[PDB]
Write a protein that binds this ligand. Sequence first.
Ligand SMILES: *[C@H](N)c1ncn(Cc2nc3cc(Cl)ccc3n2Cc2ccccc2)n1
Ligand SMILES: *[C@H](N)c1ncn(Cc2nc3cc(Cl)ccc3n2Cc2ccccc2)n1
Ligand SMILES: [Cl-]
Ligand code: NA
Lengths: 304, 306
Amino acid sequence: SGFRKMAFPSGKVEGCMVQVTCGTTTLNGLWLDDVVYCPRHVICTSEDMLNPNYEDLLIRKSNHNFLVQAGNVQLRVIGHSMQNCVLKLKVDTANPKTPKYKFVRIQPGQTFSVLACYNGSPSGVYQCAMRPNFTIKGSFLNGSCGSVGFNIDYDCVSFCYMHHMELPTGVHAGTDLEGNFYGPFVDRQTAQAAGTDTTITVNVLAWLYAAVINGDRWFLNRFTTTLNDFNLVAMKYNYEPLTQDHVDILGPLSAQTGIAVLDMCASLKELLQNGMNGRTILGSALLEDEFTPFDVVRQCSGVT
Amino acid sequence: SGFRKMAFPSGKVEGCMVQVTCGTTTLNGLWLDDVVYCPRHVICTSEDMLNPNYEDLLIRKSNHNFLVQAGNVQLRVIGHSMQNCVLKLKVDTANPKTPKYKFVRIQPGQTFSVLACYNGSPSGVYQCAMRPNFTIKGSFLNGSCGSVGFNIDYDCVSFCYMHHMELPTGVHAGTDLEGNFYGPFVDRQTAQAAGTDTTITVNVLAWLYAAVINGDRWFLNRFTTTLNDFNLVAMKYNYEPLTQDHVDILGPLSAQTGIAVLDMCASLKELLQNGMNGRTILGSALLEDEFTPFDVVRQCSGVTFQ
Ligand SMILES: *[C@H](N)c1ncn(Cc2nc3cc(Cl)ccc3n2Cc2ccccc2)n1
Ligand SMILES: *[C@H](N)c1ncn(Cc2nc3cc(Cl)ccc3n2Cc2ccccc2)n1
Ligand SMILES: [Cl-]
Ligand code: NA
């Protein structure tokens, strides 16, 4: 019993984190086999950031401009290139702690664990969702760039995020490990802003199933609705549309609790129209939307 | 910017988790050097749990009635003993991944990271506070016993919790690593229940300081309070008394923000009176009490957003 926001165990990722220095800038890199991946903005001066020509700025760099440290050991850089917004530094030593891994790009609504790092040293772990506006609500200070997000599946680490920057509202933007940004953001000092965000409807439903699994049932009611009518309500309340695919993905939780998704949708419709009447759900006075259906199943089932 | 419940990186503890089997029961153990620590209830049948005599149950066991598995490898048990409510199994192999560590018994209000495990395999990591009523609000299923809680300030793992059982309200009870329960609980099936809990006042204050550090002041007011008047009000909302020790501990956060501790106490009094008027603080619509002053200093910028 209980229901908590839970991160994946971070040990397999900890053993991949290194410090990357270029000139006066230090941030974090990810060392997998004999390549270190880090944000390409590491190469830029302050002035360069106003309008960087990364093709040219990288041409002006050589292996010698990069220092990589794994603990107390200097790794010699023997090659460099870029893939999109990620810099790749080939080093003379393969990481002996490299896990089985994949680079996976995630979709809005999906969650992942972040291992926040400073100076190549892991500092803390938390759970994040990719928001519909392609930002994440992380917790990052200066020096955190190159920290990564990931999921684990059996023995395989799926890396899905590398941290690049903080937007004016204090939310965070970054790339997949192939260096493609999430959202319409660029690694340039220019005016940029988080778009208006919305609530992840399928995740709120998943969390209402979690609440039922954990014995909190007060919001259940005799009514059902249609997918069409529910989506009219969602749109009014700045919730994402619920698709038939979402209904299918909620199938396991629906089967475990015995509550049809469109039955639960009538609960959520009433909560949006009426509020919580001073009550809480799973200890919360807000509807929580950073648990996926899989997150709920994983935690209510005890997968390792 | 941002503020999240943040656990310690779990790798140093993952390398210590093993599976312990006794008869038909499997749960987790903590392997440090050549000792595996686990809950002594592993030796009990379900019927034994009404009125166990652990001395009499344990004398009937041999080393070879315990199986310990580290990944794919069986470790041979070569000794056992009981210390309070923990069983210590001596094994034939020292753990080569043993971190620098210590054992610490914590006070109510203190936080730690929990590595929830099943069958000796880590499942997930999350933060918990030791509640005033000596329970924790975890997420544990059957098979989670022997999961541990810890902090890793400055490269040394301080183990402070081992999971033993769930109470009727769904909150969790366990021991320090010397096997002494937190609170009045026992490893026996009794009518024991969590006492009415209270809110950890010093932690709520710490979190309001975090909110100011991160740029928000809406909840401040023009008032101050005495410490005694603060406690007289706060206890009416089932908040813990604030002591002068707590005031001292909040001093660095007070210094960074320029808000006197008793001025932040006046803010909290007003929040308890008024609610949030549809606003949030650090993304929460309720007051959060599972961040310590130390936790805030650990996570937040040393530079306030003025
Ligand atoms: C990453 N660790 C980090 N720490 C601070 N920031 C913001 C920032 N500061 C600089 C300084 C220089 Cl000399 C180059 C780049 C840079 N950045 C990153 C950045 C990214 C996108 C837009 C603007 C700045 N990052
Ligand atoms: C720990 N992994 C765990 N999982 C389930 N529980 C509760 C429980 N179930 C049993 C079954 C048997 Cl055969 C013996 C003991 C036992 N316990 C532990 C318990 C029972 C009553 C009071 C305190 C602990 N624990
Ligand atoms: Cl109806
Ligand atoms: Na219904």
